[PDB]
Amino acid sequence: NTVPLKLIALLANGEFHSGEQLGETLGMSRAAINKHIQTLRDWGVDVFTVPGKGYSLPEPIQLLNAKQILGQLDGGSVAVLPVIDSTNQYLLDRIGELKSGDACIAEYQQAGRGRRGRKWFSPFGANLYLSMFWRLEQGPAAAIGLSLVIGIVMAEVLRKLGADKVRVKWPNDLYLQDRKLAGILVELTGKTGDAAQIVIGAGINMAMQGWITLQEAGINLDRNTLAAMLIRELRAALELFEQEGLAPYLSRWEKLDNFINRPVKLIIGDKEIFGISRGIDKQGALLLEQDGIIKPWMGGEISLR
Numbered sequence: 001n002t003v004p005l006k007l008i009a010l011l012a013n014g015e016f017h018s019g020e021q022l023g024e025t026l027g028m029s030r031a032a033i034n035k036h037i038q039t040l041r042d043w044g045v046d047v048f049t050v051p052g053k054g055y056s057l058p059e060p061i062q063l064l065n066a067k068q069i070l071g072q073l074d075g076g077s078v079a080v081l082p083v084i085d086s087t088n089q090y091l092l093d094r095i096g097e098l099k100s101g102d103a104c105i106a107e108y109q110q111a112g113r114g115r116r117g118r119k120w121f122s123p124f125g126a127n128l129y130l131s132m133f134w135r136l137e138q139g140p141a142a143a144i145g146l147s148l149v150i151g152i153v154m155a156e157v158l159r160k161l162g163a164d165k166v167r168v169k170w171p172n173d174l175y176l177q178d179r180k181l182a183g184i185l186v187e188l189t190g191k192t193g194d195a196a197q198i199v200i201g202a203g204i205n206m207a208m209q210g211w212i213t214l215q216e217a218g219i220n221l222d223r224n225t226l227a228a229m230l231i232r233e234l235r236a237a238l239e240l241f242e243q244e245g246l247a248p249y250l251s252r253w254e255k256l257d258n259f260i261n262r263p264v265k266l267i268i269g270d271k272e273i274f275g276i277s278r279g280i281d282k283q284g285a286l287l288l289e290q291d292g293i294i295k296p297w298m299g300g301e302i303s304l305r
């Protein structure tokens with residue numbers, strides 16, 4: 001899967017390359033070069049061909065840079081995949097060579113997946129596809145605020161890099177102009193009386209419904225920075241979490257919650273609760289008030305009313 005990665009690696013500028021310059025550099029035929037080209041077209045890559053001359057990218061992409069990323073971070077263990085099934089799987093598939101905070105990003109995911117068996121959609125270098133491994137001592141017991149924590153953090157990072165208006169949805173997504181901007185998939189394995197092993201996936205809509213991307217709201221952030229900022233502050237919070245639970249969030253959450261003090265709809269399976277958000281409880285529980293009556297709920301999905 002090399003060559004592709006090389007090609008792509010040079011077309012990245014958004015300029016013209018004749019199959020001529022490419023093949024010599026690559027030390028291969030124009031002929032060979034056209035096959036790789038296909039592979040590319042396949043990764044969501046939009047290659048513009050001009051028959052016997054050369055190739056071009058409609059748009060210039062910015063690839064991930066291990067080193068750039070590695071660079072910062074402070075003490076970091078990151079895997080930078082270019083191509084893979086899915087960032088979550090990769091780690092799930094390897095829970096025991098892993099340690100807390102281990103991460104990885106890919107340029108493109110062949111089987112990107114969401115919550116409730118939904119396809120994620122992960123074209124080469126258009127966005128941010130990331131996952132982080134974390135282990136919890138008490139075990140399966142937690143997670144809940146773990147995820148609140150994650151969304152919270154992400155909102156902060158975004159907010160600080162530009163995108164000043166990003167908010168959070170209880171319990172798993174980022175919002176902007178009320179459309180879904182990022183998606184979060186947390187997956188746990190546990191035992192009774194034994195650590196919970198967590199794999200956390202975050203998907204962020206960068207490049208250009210009900211869904212929204214950073215580019216449409218006109219925000220144009222650096223990928224590598226983004227990346228690196230994320231991992232660093234999550235490592236930081238997952239600890240803090242590890243050490244305290246929600247205690248430290250709560251107020252954080254309230255100021256970023258997109259639906260607080262608004263009409264919504266909560267459902268576990270097919271069961272519909274209707275009313276007003278009063279936030280979250282000390283247990284990452286949703287607060288729902290129905291007729292001057294506030295109550296806690298740890299499940300279902302939240303849409304608006």
Ligand SMILES: O=C(O)CCCC[C@@H]1SC[C@@H]2NC(=O)N[C@@H]21
Nearest residue numbers: 086113114115130183184201203
């Ligand atoms: O909206 C959802 O249902 C959550 C989507 C989470 C997608 C991200 S992309 C990186 C990580 N690995 C995956 O395959 N999924 C998460």
